[PDB]
Amino acid sequence: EIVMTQSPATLSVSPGERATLSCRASQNISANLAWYQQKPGQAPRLLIHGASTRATGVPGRFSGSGSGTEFTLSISSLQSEDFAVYYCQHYNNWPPLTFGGGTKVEIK
Amino acid sequence: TNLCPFGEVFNATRFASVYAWNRKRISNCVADYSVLYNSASFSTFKCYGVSPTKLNDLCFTNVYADSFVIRGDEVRQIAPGQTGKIADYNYKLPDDFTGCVIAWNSNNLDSKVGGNYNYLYRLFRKSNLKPFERDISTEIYQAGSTPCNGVEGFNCYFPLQSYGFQPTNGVGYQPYRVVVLSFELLHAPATVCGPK
Amino acid sequence: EVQLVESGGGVVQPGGSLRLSCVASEFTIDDYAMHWVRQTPGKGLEWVSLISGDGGRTFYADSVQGRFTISRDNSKNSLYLQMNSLRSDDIGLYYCAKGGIFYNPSRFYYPNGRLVGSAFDIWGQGTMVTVSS
Ligand SMILES: *[C@@H]1O[C@H](CO)[C@@H](O)[C@H](O)[C@H]1NC(C)=O
The domain total for chain B is 1
Residue B189 domain-assigned (yes or no): no
Residue B37 domain-assigned (yes or no): yes
Nearest CA in chain C to A40: C41
Sequence-ordered list of residues with C-beta below 8 angstroms from that of A95, at least 6 positions apart, any chain: C33, C47, C50, C59, C102, C115, C118
Residue B193 domain-assigned (yes or no): no
- DSSP letter string over A12-58? E--TTS-EEEEEEESS--SS-B-EEEE-TTS--EEEE-SSS-B-TT-
Contacts of B154 in chain C (CB under 8 A): 100, 117, 119, 121
Sequence-ordered list of residues with C-beta below 8 angstroms from that of A75, at least 6 positions apart, any chain: A18, A19, A20, A21, A61, A62, A63, A82
Query: Does ligand 1 lie within 6 Å of residue B33's CB atom?
Result: no
Question: How large is the greatest C-alpha to C-alpha distance in chain B, in angstroms?
Answer: 62
Is residue B85 less than 8 Å (CB to CB) from chain C? yes
Residue B192 domain-assigned (yes or no): no
Q: Which of C103, C112, C120, C122 should we substitute to test contact with B (largest number of B Cβ atoms within 10 Å)?
A: C103
User: Using alpha carbons only, how large is chain B's radius of gyration in Å?
Assistant: 18
What's B55's domain CATH number? 3.30.70.1840
Residue B177 domain-assigned (yes or no): yes
Q: Are C40 and C34 in contact (CB under 8 A)?
A: no
Minimal C-alpha gap between B90 and chain A (Å) = 27
Residue type for position B61: T
| Best of B8, B9, B11, B106 for a ligand 1 pocket test (most atoms within 8 Å of beta carbon) | B11
Resolution in Å, one decimal place: 3.6
Residue nearest to atom 13 of ligand 1 (CA): B7
Handedness of CA A29, A98, A53, C98 (dihedral sign): positive
Solved with:
cryo-EM
φ, ψ of residue A85 in degrees (nearest 5): -115, 130
Alpha-carbon distances, residue C119 vs A28, A76, C35, C78, C99 (angstroms): 18, 23, 10, 20, 5
B7: CA distance to ligand 1 center in Å? 7
Q: Which of A97, A98, A99 should we substitute to test contact with C (largest number of C Cβ atoms within 10 Å)?
A: A97
Compute the C-alpha angle B148/A48/A101, nearest 5°: 135
CB atoms under 10 Å from CB of B40, counted, come to 7
Nearest CA in chain B to A51: B153
Q: Which of A89, A95, A101 shows the shortest C-beta gap to C119?
A: A89
CA distance A93 to C115: 5
CA distance B146 to A54: 9
Residue B81 domain-assigned (yes or no): yes
Residue B54 domain-assigned (yes or no): yes
Query: Does ligand 1 lie within 6 Å of residue B11's CB atom?
Result: yes
Q: Are strands B47-48 and B99-105 parallel, antiparallel or unpaired?
A: antiparallel
Burial class (CB in 10 A: 0-12, 13-18, 19+), B98: middle
| Residue B65: closest CA among B111, B112, B8 | B8
Fold of C3-128: Immunoglobulin-like (2.60.40)
Domain spanning A4-106, CATH class = mainly beta
| Residue B115: closest CA among A77, C63, C104 | C104
CB atoms under 10 Å from CB of B135, counted, come to 15
Q: What SS3 state is found at B38?
A: helix
Q: Which of B85, B123, B169 shows the shortest C-beta gap to C101?
A: B123
Burial class (CB in 10 A: 0-12, 13-18, 19+), B31: buried
Contacts of B162 in chain C (CB under 8 A): 103-106, 109, 113
Residue B1 domain-assigned (yes or no): no
Q: Are strands A35-38 and A10-12 parallel, antiparallel or unpaired?
A: unpaired
Q: Which of B142, B146, B154, B158 should we substitute to test contact with A (largest number of A Cβ atoms within 10 Å)?
A: B154
State the residue range of the domain holding B130: 6-184
Residue type for position C23: V
Q: How many residues does chain C have?
A: 133
The domains of chain C are located at 3-128
Nearest CA in chain A to C59: A95
Sequence-ordered list of residues with C-beta below 8 angstroms from that of A63, at least 6 positions apart, any chain: A52, A54, A73, A74, A75, A76
